[PDB]
Scaffold this active site. Structure first.
Site: not given
Lengths: 138, 138, 138, 138, 138, 138
Positions: B47, B53, B56-57, B61
């Site tokens: 990713h 980058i 976002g998830v 967390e």
């Protein structure tokens, strides 16, 4: 849609793949996808050592990756908004995620979607996701 | 609060640790924590292969793990609700996440919190998180 | 110099990337790079499980990779051939930033010689004198 | 060894002499994690990791006789030849002094007959006073 | 080899005879990924992975002479002795027939002199007709 | 039998867990277990990068781990000693569920013998006859 049509459709590669197969597909409004939860996945070593449960943020990513597959079977997608995300039941190794995605807008250089994830036939998660479309901003 | 006070405070172990140090702490209302983004982390391999980058998830967390540290410095925490989560700027290897957490309720067997993440001194993410407290339901 | 140039310039890819970005670079004389130390990196599960310390040898590799950026933005697998006057003082842990300074003393004799000093915020924690070798296609 | 994978660099100690000499063997293979990114073009054992095989052969002596010994000085280290999967290191370490809370040693690493590397190492002896020391630095 | 890590189980082929015989060497070490969980109590090379070293020594022959050869029959496979880090396999494969779109072979694996395993393997020869076949099964 | 019993009963931990849960179990006669095949598992990045197939040898280990659950819920590192009549027919890919059936034929003679058949939805894809050995503490 078998797993290796999914591979080139998803920009993500392991360790961050959360789609294994797509059962249904409506060209630009609806898709359902499958994620097998197996104890041999890397996140279960540290989440948690005592009890193996799929993190909620990775279920949102499973929702997002099912949306990207719909979008790129429909003529960089960054998740930018999470709204009304509800997590109901623990997800355990051995479960199958039936990930549902409904499309709400593809008109704002991005996409509002509303997703529902289910284990065998009961809901375990929902969310309203919104992405943004960029390619080498520099 | 150095990294290895954090280790036993967090139930998560690698590959799912997203807190490296806690700068400030108000016993039960406010905490700020630091996350170093390094290109040698496992998620950046897939990713993305072309552009690295932070997902976002995983920032959510990072917000949630900063909340758990506040909660367990304050006398299993499962993230159950994500509301009004906004993602503004791409997070790149080399950045430091200054993760802010404000407490909104600890009264519903769970906790409503509202978090703000920033790179050097500008906001890159925000969210309103709600957890649930369970221990060996069976 | 941001990370996407770092990754195209370095021959080392994960799990062996130890440079995140460069902040000041001047054309075959001196370079300064930044390494973020994160608890979620793959080496810290083994070094050590009891107490997470950045291994000293990997600080040398961070010195080496920083000058490979310098060698190669200046007109091939650069391999380490000698290390002298390598002094390490303080343990560097997750949460710290390594500001890697490299100064060129002699460039290609089929190999280059550099003096490098690594620092945490401004206290020196590691320094060494490195000489590399430029290669065949054996 | 205080370390585990991914940072274990010894398999067998063939000859042990109580307080000044060992010979150890770490043996190289393609499934080690470092060769996935060093290098993708072709696999060479990094020179800094060969130093670990020296340091770990050292630390096995100092507590098989007479337990975290941090690397403090690396002088006169030469890496003459590349190390490739299929090869087998033969690490010899001669102790020279146990002066104070550290130890100076001379190591020579050998493949089948030829010599691929050597170094002169010096460590530091603490276990858990080391934490508050690391606490005092921050 | 068609595979890479984490599933590469050959380092060197010492003796090659055009169409019926090789001897190969995969060599065992502590930093391989399988020994982290097989077993945490103590490390033994799994018997099924020793079969891969046999199958991969086979497949190197069949395309170093005369390219995904899937494992189809494993008869008469005995695992006499445990394989431990520090050991070195010496895989011999004798080809017995190239009958049709597959091949029957007899493999014997040896550590320094003793014999630790043997098997009789039979594979199947396709590359990319195999996809639509896998498509037709679903 | 859910996964947390599976993980306490199996001596194999990640990366070598190949059982997710058991659905029917009857006391030293017959057991049936489920393995979810996910594209995010560690073996599929290497087998193969070109085309993700579950390795045949790891289906045997899945047969082996399923009966270790059966052996051990029925009054130690159970190691594979022999494999006969191992037949594999169809490639199993991410997205499939393996329903692992094991039938006991003879129990401890210092080792046990079982007949095992693995299936996808109801089509047989792998079958074998396994014999294990019970162990020392050498």
């Amino acid at each position: 849609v078998l797993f290796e049509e999914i591979r080139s459709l998803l920009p993500q590669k392991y360790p961050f793949i959360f789609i294994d197969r797509a059962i249904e597909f409506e060209e630009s409004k609806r898709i359902v996808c499958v994620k097998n939860i197996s104890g041999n996945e890397p996140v279960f070593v540290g989440h948690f050592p005592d009890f193996a449960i799929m993190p909620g943020v990775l279920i949102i990513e499973a929702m997002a990756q099912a949306s990207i597959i719909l979008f790129r079977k429909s003529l960089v997608f960054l998740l930018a908004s999470v709204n009304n995300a509800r997590f109901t039941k623990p997800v355990v190794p051995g479960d199958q995620l039936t990930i549902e995605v409904i499309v709400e807008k593809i008109v704002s250089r991005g996409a509002i979607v509303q997703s529902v994830v289910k284990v065998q036939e009961k809901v375990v998660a929902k969310a309203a996701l919104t992405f943004g479309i960029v390619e080498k901003s520099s």
